[PDB]
Design a protein around this ligand. Sequence first.
Ligand SMILES: *[C@@H]1O[C@H](CO)[C@@H](O[C@@H]2O[C@H](CO)[C@@H](O[C@@H]3O[C@H](CO)[C@@H](O)[C@H](O)[C@@H]3O)[C@H](O)[C@H]2NC(C)=O)[C@H](O)[C@H]1NC(C)=O
Ligand code: NA
Ligand code: NA
Ligand SMILES: [Zn+2]
Ligand SMILES: [Zn+2]
Ligand SMILES: [Zn+2]
Length: 752
Amino acid sequence: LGSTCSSPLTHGSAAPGDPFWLQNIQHQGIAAFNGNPGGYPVFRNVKNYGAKGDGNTDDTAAIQAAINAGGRCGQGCDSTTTQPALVYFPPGTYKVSSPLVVLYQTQLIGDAKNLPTLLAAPNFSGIALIDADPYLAGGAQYYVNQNNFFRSVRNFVIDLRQVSGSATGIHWQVSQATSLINIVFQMSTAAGNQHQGIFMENGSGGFLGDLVFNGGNIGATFGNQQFTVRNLTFNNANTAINAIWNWGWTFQRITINNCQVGFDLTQGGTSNTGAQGVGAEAIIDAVVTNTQTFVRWSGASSGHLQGSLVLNNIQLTNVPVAVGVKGGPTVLAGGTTTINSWAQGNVYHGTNGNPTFTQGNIANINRPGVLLDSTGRIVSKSHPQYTGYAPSDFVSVRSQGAKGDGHTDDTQAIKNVFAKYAGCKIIFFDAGTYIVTDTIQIPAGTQIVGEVWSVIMGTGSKFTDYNNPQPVIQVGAPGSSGVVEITDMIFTTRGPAAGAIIVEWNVHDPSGQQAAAGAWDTHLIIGGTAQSGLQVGQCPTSGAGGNNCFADFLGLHLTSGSSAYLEGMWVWLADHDLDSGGSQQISLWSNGGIMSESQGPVWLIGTASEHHINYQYFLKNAANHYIGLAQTETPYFQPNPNPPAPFITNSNFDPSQLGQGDAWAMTVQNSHGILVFGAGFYSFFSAYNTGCQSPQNCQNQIVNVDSSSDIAFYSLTTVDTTWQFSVNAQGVINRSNNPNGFADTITAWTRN
Ligand SMILES: *[C@@H]1O[C@H](CO)[C@@H](O[C@@H]2O[C@H](CO)[C@@H](O[C@@H]3O[C@H](CO)[C@@H](O)[C@H](O)[C@@H]3O)[C@H](O)[C@H]2NC(C)=O)[C@H](O)[C@H]1NC(C)=O
Ligand code: NA
Ligand code: NA
Ligand SMILES: [Zn+2]
Ligand SMILES: [Zn+2]
Ligand SMILES: [Zn+2]
């Protein structure tokens, strides 16, 4: 506990009628590497830019000014980390008549106590009320969809009911480090209406959750490589989810009430040169009621894989068809029943490389008890927003002397803040970049909150020695337990930093509070950003930057006694430069992405780890993990050089069996109670050359397990890898058995 208090802060001090704390907290954020840090506003209240919120005045322009102020990353700019915006909406009804363009690095946030309404004018025109990637003349766009990062929308009612024709709430064409949180969509239920909550046509996601859709022809149209979706509820839609294509998604805690079709899945071809449909859906903990068909495939499967489905713990009440084909036969009869574990696709066991094509029950999926809540379902916990807390319940790091200017050493100021306030006040990291040169230990009990781009950036000699790696951030002391909630933070390095363990996570849940220790909208954005020392100017793809281009040793280290609920966390070793212009590829060196030795519970909900040398995920002597979906990419320079270079072998942090020319996506040693429920593990290059994509042999192996680990994989999708699955570094499952469009999919693997 911090020295300023004697009992922990366990609830907020706000009066019931006070506005949400974010409105009146002091606004002190800085964009450290902006052209004008002293004049560029991070926080923008829409009402300060002329918005009335009276439901009659057209507020479109005023909101757009709140978004646009300061000279931001719009047309002609690829991406940025230096032009953030938190666009804030106090309660009210905001009438809008054309799309709100949510520029790169923008969050739209409403009052969480009394959700503001975005009200579509009867004459609304444009792609959607909120547009994260506008289309221009000739079908060019503001941003490349696969690079469309750093976007959030939180705490709104989006009301389309005044629009007589077609209308869409959100054009959510996005990739990683994005979120939708706590939105209610209100749409028409009139026969023939053309309302649609979300339209997403492509991208590389991503996490979204805690949404409610009321009415409409379509709740959400989804098309994207991969995404994790948690706690979506659809009421009275014609089609809840129109899934047009993917490589693979995970849907957790979905509720569908009174719809015609729950999941309408488009079946595509199996060739990587053919039509792409929905490769794979993994659905866990669903409740479906009074709905004609729960899952509908657009075409039938004929004794071989062509679109994968895994269903786990599905409660149906008056749902005649559990799994059906559009204008075709029932595949799984519904009614009123609970589906334990069911699959469509190729099922595998042990070292048997030959598929069992299945459309039927599979062995009950094991769900370790510690990963389940009192209702027996995978834990579901939203981004903590402290809705009952007053501004006085927070302490500002700026007010306590942390500059956040990307230059001043803020190590002592930050240490002092934790020493004084941990557990006494919510720690508010005003937007900025905070240079630290020693370990920042976040005590057990602490709650920390950022502001769009709040970065702790470790650098200097404490972090440069790969023979003696050291933690930049320490989440709890070793052996600690308690609440640790981290929201909207970035943790990273200023290079070179060959010894940095960016986050060492030690704390465990206290008794009786699951997921008390966790992170949301919190990412490790490693290199590729302004004044990181890890940009194209320092680290060209030639590799000429050499020893200057060590970015970290390890992204995330979950230690033996820890637990963690990590939602949407991207542990990204930069493959390209976000700030120099032109999205130029770069070569940076990270030894490994995520290593867990935790005995659990660990929930990795929509996490990703990309471009690390030895592995993206390494589970070493771990237990009780729920992981879904997990997504990975191999670094683009491999196999030039082969792992572990330019690091050296380290028996403490490396797996026993190093990657064969390329990093493992996931490698597992001596672990038990591991459930991987949706995975997207990809390889796109051989030393920056894309030729391997056609023969689909960019790397030879990608997932490794030892002989004894108690682990199961469901809906494991890989890209351009010969052996999708290995035991003891010998390929067992060949991609030739599982072609599923652009990607290849293993529907289930178990040890026995
Ligand atoms: C699924 O997502 C929905 C939408 O965010 C979640 O519903 C929301 O949950 C919060 C937290 O419980 C509710 O706030 C509470 O309201 C009650 C009633 O006034 C109050 O007593 C509490 O102190 C708290 O403020 C909120 O009403 C509710 N919002 C909506 C639109 O339903 C839900 O919790 C999520 N469920 C899971 C399993 O993650
Ligand atoms: Na460009
Ligand atoms: Na360790
Ligand atoms: Zn927050
Ligand atoms: Zn890139
Ligand atoms: Zn435990």
